[PDB]
Design an enzyme around this catalytic site. Structure first.
Site, mmCIF file in Angstrom:
data_model
loop_
_atom_site.group_PDB
_atom_site.id
_atom_site.type_symbol
_atom_site.label_atom_id
_atom_site.label_comp_id
_atom_site.label_asym_id
_atom_site.label_seq_id
_atom_site.Cartn_x
_atom_site.Cartn_y
_atom_site.Cartn_z
ATOM 1 C CG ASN C 153 -0.190 43.247 37.587
ATOM 2 O OD1 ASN C 153 0.511 42.296 37.254
ATOM 3 N ND2 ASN C 153 -1.515 43.159 37.684
ATOM 4 C CD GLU C 249 -1.425 33.154 38.543
ATOM 5 O OE1 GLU C 249 -0.788 34.236 38.529
ATOM 6 O OE2 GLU C 249 -1.486 32.416 39.548
ATOM 7 C CB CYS C 283 -5.713 39.548 37.473
ATOM 8 S SG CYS C 283 -4.253 39.838 36.472
#
Lengths: 474, 474, 474, 474
Positions: C153, C249, C283
């Site tokens: 992304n 992450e 996220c």
């Protein structure tokens, strides 16, 4: 009466002349303090200068150890010191004991804070490639001899706030308490004497301003002047300091901005505690209420009944409102009261004076044309100034030459923060009365309220300089 | 007729009267700068104060963008500005261009440093249990209007060292370059004008000290005075500033302490570079050598020969030694040279002066009764003082009223650090000549050398205050 | 085909085998990237380790100059790179260009932050008197070889966020872009190549996870793994990293807590932007709304109409909602949608899917029994969970395995801070959607959301270690 | 006999099974500790988890007060605890009492260090103009439940180094002392019990590794694992931790680099003290001497003479060389001795073993082919490795898998610093034996020596995370 002595180079010394001190609430003789000569001030400074190298040579933990002991002694003798302090500056007894306790707290905190004042390593390669092998090891160093001058309203507490930070960093001290408060200042000295700090490290000076006032500040031995007092004397000290570093804590006229969405009961209670504490004889204190019109009537009525609940009387009886420090101060307060009344202000509570004991007064309908809207009274009088916009409250607030602190009462925090930015003050409290409170927080003023940043860590960095050592690697 | 103009509130302004500037070396007329009236200074200040709120309102990154643009322009025009700078203060051409490059470097570095001055959050619970829910959000704010005054020896470099750090933080500027160096200061101004900073954010002031010297400092619109110049004027500023914050960079008499284990060739090389750079017209520069007797003869011989290898002549020829700034200065330096010679110091170079060009001269066997042992010459003359111990070197070094920097030449670093601690200076370089060098490093001076801590980050901190917002968490 | 090459040791290299990449929104072949072998990975690592000492040896400013140049190049080529990125990961055209700009911003910021990572000097005397002459000079150093792995992304942005902070400190890089996003990663590599960094300092790795996935992580040459990806892949990297430093992450299921006093229009606007940006493939994004029952109906209606306002279509048309990254993802998201629908949740938008383009959908009355209340969809689907108290909202929010960020919509700030203290997340935004926002701010996530603290300064600190040099002063 | 109990949830609890502890030197039974089950571990964790929020809800000063009390009790019983500690791990009596004193020191320092936990405020305008009204208030928060595991050599000291920093920040503790050292660990637990910390804030765990070893680390309630012990066990924890934060203090093979200009007598004394302390049973200890050939003979002779002066015997006699912890430890050391001897090394001091008491051995002529040149013995054996260049010394030093600390003996400081930069260790001591020394300094290792940075402030930073609250000013 009891003839108190100055602590000079490890010895207790009386002077040829003395100054008798009397209790503001009764006029009773409290005792006497020495009226030092310039020659005597010279000895104090010479002793301190001689002692500084050995003091700086000790480890940080050793200096903190001395300071912790001093604090322990104060806690042990808090009732003894508080009793005299209460009488000397007409402060309620319990409040006086509180001052001593807070002094021990700040001294202990400064002791531990000061031993954690780290240095830094700088890289030459951060600025130019050719200096990539060049590094600067920068460490903190004391400034030398610090002259600490405390105020009458907090002769002990606002003495320790300067003394402890100075001492932990390796500086030596010359402590000058206010004449009205010197006995208490000398009692504070006894703790330092008993703690066993080397001779010359901590010294005290007492005397008449006409004789030693400028002398103590202009003296070339003094490397830093840390003072709390009137703006007029602060201005004079700034000039006399020349190029030497200073820290000044001067007047205040803290504004309490009240918006239409504020909790009026909480606001009223905070305004009462802040404005009337110690009969308004505090630099950080609500001294003017700038309230939006629509909620003004309601807030004022809430404050009026709360003023009526305040106790009035003697320090030994822990009264909220005690007699003012002196006759001249009380007269000055009346002048302000007269001016306001003459110009149209409404005293919602009784205007009465007995001796130097003025009852708490709530003044509504106060305008910018009145001296009471601007001058710091140091008396139990609170002016309410009705505004029609937040913009007006900010312009009125900022027009003051004072800028110590401000209170914002509202439920819209982002707005409160925006307003806080515009306010020319050091600290802004949201939904709380102004306060120096929590001594680790910074305490400072804008404009004529002072110079330098207080608060434990800040006062420590202020009375220290740096020594940079540069060398190339390999 | 090459009449330069001040940059005031976004416009270029001439004054009724002008001051013609001449090249120190050739005497050629360079042009003229405005001789501002007291009323014109008023307008500059009014313009700055008016524009300050909007400038502070911009984001930090936007202010940095403006600054980076100024630096880019200075780099773009480094030869053109350096050409005029060289002629205006009789500085070697290449060195003049280097001053412009360093000004660009300092401006860029300040822009980025200022973007990273983090705030702090403090806990009430660190000091008192009852205040555990109370936190303090502390953020930096500008002081307002900063008055920056640069010196003749670095009119551009020591202008940018003040201007950039002040601007990035939200302060506005009023720049007063030295009269001999005002054309160069106005050239720097052009870069700020072309960069497009908002009108009133950056302004210049030029004029006669007899007309505006005190006026620009005593003006209450000024919130901070940042100055580099004579100690005499520095003292005066300290007084006129009152309790307002200041930054002062005054004279220096940097000592180079040479120990018995020193690398003599390296020591000689550094001493020469430091002592004679720009004909000794630098505050940070070796101005006295305190050498241990045993290596004295050897060091002196090396320095003697190196002095004779120095180039003497005109700025356009990049000579090591160029004519001094003015006649009064050359008269002063020659008087110092004569005092040493008349008193019996061993001259190791001929005494020669042509116009205001004084040839470099070395004096050995300099004693404490000679003026050259203490007075700052700002001329190409170096005194050698022989000592018997490090103890003696430290005593002589500390006896000076100056305390800018010091150099220590030895291979014993632990002992070098020990000596550094005792030396009353700001920076101590080990095995290197003194230098403000690498602008991210702190630059400061003890005693009469100054007030305040310089270097990029320290300058930003000095020209900013703090705003604390306190609230309770529920 | 349009065959891309890896950048290894200053040269562009193809592999024996390749991987063809297609546009997710059309299926059109975009080009191919090398399918590296384990031996080719060995060479990349060998090259970096070999170049590290010389890279570390350069000054900080030199490494910063290289980085600034990379950012300058990315800015020039933002449209060229963004166009391919848009096609490769089906991100809106303008949005893809924005990612390249953000990458340049991060690179420039990290370059300037990293040259200001000051060291510290500690005193032995702070701890014990006997060690008062002992000091510790503590400076930062690189960890060595950093393996940076970016997500699909943000293949470029979340590459730069790791690469720049690592490089400025003196570390070398091995960059592994996601396969679907490898072309964009290689385009980023072109900027580094043109900037001219020394051979081996920056290298890329592309290939099949089945062939090099675990190999690149398990390799002893790697000193640090910085990864953004699935929670599952992240979980095994923690294991494969052993006791080596890592940065992870992973997913998130950010809750937006809406209280009764919230500004519903502002809340709806923020929730829409946060929840549907890049079709929910982020996220940090609102993935569940915990709204007080009293204001639920009104808020839901607002969000309902705003979803119908969202543009749906092709990346080249800048549609808000574009096709999902792949078929597997779209199948997964459709299963989550059907689960909520079959279980009785109130669908406030039609359920529609064309190819892998899922139209944005709002579900009200979502219960804890539905998968959509817990699982991270990475799709345009938003569940609304009605609560009866903030206590309940906190319980529900904390019950999740994820704890990246959370939003709180209310006009009561003190309470908002209290709620924030109880939420098991890294960042809490008051009256604003969640966001990695302004990269100077810290970015971290509690629980299953990851490990390590990011944001520029934090990322630099994490990818560096400390070297302490202790010596005694005489 | 003397059955010891675990402190669990404010209660002293015995287990169904027990582990009898015997004195390493005499073989005499000291008592027994509980052989906890996984269910009892479950209870301890449940207890701490329940008590954490209330512990965290207390003010920092309140937590510091509890810590100071523990330290005072420890100082009061330093002889009582030291008596048992001496017998349990065969450490000299005075050294055992010394361990207790340092423990109270670290606890006191951590209390005051942690008390001063302050966050930071960041500006969005530093990164993006559009986010200038956006600020981030960043504050520290505890990680939750910390699992503290101490080593046999410092069961109390290296328990306190983990416990105090954790507790001040608001974390709860689960303390697992080494089985051989559990009694002393439980004695430390008594002080925490007497200080009166809330039930569940401080708990202890004892038992067999085969039964609860992995369980204690794998458990989901644990948020952080702070361990000191073998590298092998450390590698296991690194994997078992998954993504959870850890701190590991593992092996060490500290090299002492001796150059030709080193003060040989000072060097020899330091090497003797660092290498033979506690019979070489220290992680931070001189474990290999890399000396320049030209001065090797002289240094070796000096060390030989000093080895013979060391005392050998029982703990209650304060012998320098005491029996090793166990038989397997002594067997391992003997294997290393045999290898070196068989390979040609020269034993300059008698090789002798009685029981588990191995006399001090100085091995000269040690080569890189020998195990003793690399493996950590944890026995009184010191290998001398002769080199012919500083380049070789650095190479040999860095080839080690260990990188805790290193010593450099030379009089050329700039060179010493350059060498320090090259050495892959956490701390480098110039002209001093390696040491964890002054706990305020950072303590860390490179490579296989550990993970995370210790030292008071660093330990506190490690066991805390960050909570960021972001909002826009209006």
């Amino acid at each position: 009466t009891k003839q108190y002595k100055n602590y000079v180079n490890g010895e207790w010394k009386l002077s040829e002349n003395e100054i008798k001190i009397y209790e503001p609430a009764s006029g009773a003789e409290l005792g006497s303090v020495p009226a030092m000569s310039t020659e005597e001030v010279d000895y104090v400074y010479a002793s301190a200068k001689k002692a500084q190298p050995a003091w700086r040579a000790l480890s940080y933990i050793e200096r903190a150890a001395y300071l912790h002991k001093v604090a322990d002694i104060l806690m042990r003798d808090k009732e003894k010191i508080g009793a005299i302090l209460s009488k000397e500056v007409a402060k309620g007894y319990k409040s006086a004991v509180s001052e001593v306790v807070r002094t021990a707290e700040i001294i202990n905190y400064a002791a531990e804070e000061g031993l954690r004042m780290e240095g830094e390593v700088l890289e030459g390669g951060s600025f130019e490639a050719a200096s990539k092998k060049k590094i600067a090891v920068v460490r903190r160093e004391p400034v030398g001899l610090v002259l600490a001058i405390s105020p009458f309203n907090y002769p002990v507490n606002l003495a320790g706030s300067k003394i402890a930070p100075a001492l932990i960093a390796g500086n030596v001290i010359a402590f000058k308490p206010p004449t009205q408060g010197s006995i208490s200042g000398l009692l504070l000295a006894e703790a330092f004497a008993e703690a066993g700090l080397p001779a010359g490290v901590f010294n005290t000076i007492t005397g008449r301003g006409s004789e030693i006032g400028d002398y103590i500040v202009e003296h070339q031995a003094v490397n830093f002047i840390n003072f709390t007092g009137s703006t007029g004397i602060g201005e004079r000290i700034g000039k006399m300091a020349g190029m030497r570093p200073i820290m000044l804590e001067l007047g205040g006229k803290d504004s309490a901005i009240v918006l239409e969405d504020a909790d009026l009961e909480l606001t009223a209670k905070n305004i009462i505690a802040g404005a009337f504490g110690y009969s308004g004889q505090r630099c950080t204190a609500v001294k003017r209420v700038l309230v939006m019109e629509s909620v003004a009537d309601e807030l004022v009525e809430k404050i009026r009944e709360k003023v009526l609940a305040l106790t009035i009387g003697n320090p030994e009886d822990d009264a909220d409102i005690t007699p003012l420090i002196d006759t001249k101060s009380a007269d000055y307060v009346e002048g302000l009261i007269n001016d306001a009344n003459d110009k149209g202000a409404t005293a919602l509570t009784e205007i009465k004076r007995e001796g130097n004991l003025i009852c708490p007064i709530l003044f509504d309908k106060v305008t910018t044309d009145m001296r009471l809207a601007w001058e710091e009274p140091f008396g139990p009088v609170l002016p309410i100034i009705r505004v029609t916009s937040v913009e007006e409250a900010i312009e009125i607030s900022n027009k003051s030459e004072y800028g110590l602190q401000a209170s914002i009462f509202t439920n819209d925090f982002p707005r409160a923060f925006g307003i806080a930015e515009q306010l020319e003050v050091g600290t802004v409290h949201i939904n709380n009365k102004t306060q120096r409170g929590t001594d680790n927080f910074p305490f400072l003023g804008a404009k004529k309220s002072g110079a330098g940043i207080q608060g434990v860590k800040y006062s420590i960095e202020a009375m220290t300089t740096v020594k940079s050592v540069v060398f190339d690697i390999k």
